[PDB]
Amino acid sequence: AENSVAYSNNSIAIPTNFTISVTTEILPVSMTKTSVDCTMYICGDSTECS
């Protein structure tokens, strides 16, 4: 929205009320601890591949 501030050198605006807002913030912390068997993934139960 367009909003021009009504500035004047003699005038000020002071709020007379307040709102208490509970704003939700989501933060990642950890991820999946994957472990990879390289021999089994590369070689599908092959001795010659191993």
Ligand X SMILES: *[C@@H]1O[C@H](CO)[C@@H](O[C@@H]2O[C@H](CO)[C@@H](O)[C@H](O)[C@H]2NC(C)=O)[C@H](O)[C@H]1NC(C)=O
Residues that bind other proteins (CB under 8 A): 32, 35, 37, 40, 44-45
Task: Based on the shown chain and the rule CB under 6 A, indicate whether residue 16 belongs to the binding site for ligand X.
Answer: yes
Q: What is the DSSP letter of 48?
A: T
**What gap in Å lies between CA 50 and CA 42, rounded to an integer?**
9
CA–CA gap between residue 50 and residue 38 (Å, rounded): 10
Near ligand X by CB under 6 A: residue from 3, 10, 11, 17: 17
For residues 34 and 31, what is the distance between their CA atoms, to the nearest angstrom?
A: 9
Cβ distance to ligand X smaller for residue 20 or 29: 20
16 binds, among ligand X, other proteins, none (CB under 5 to 8 A by kind): ligand X
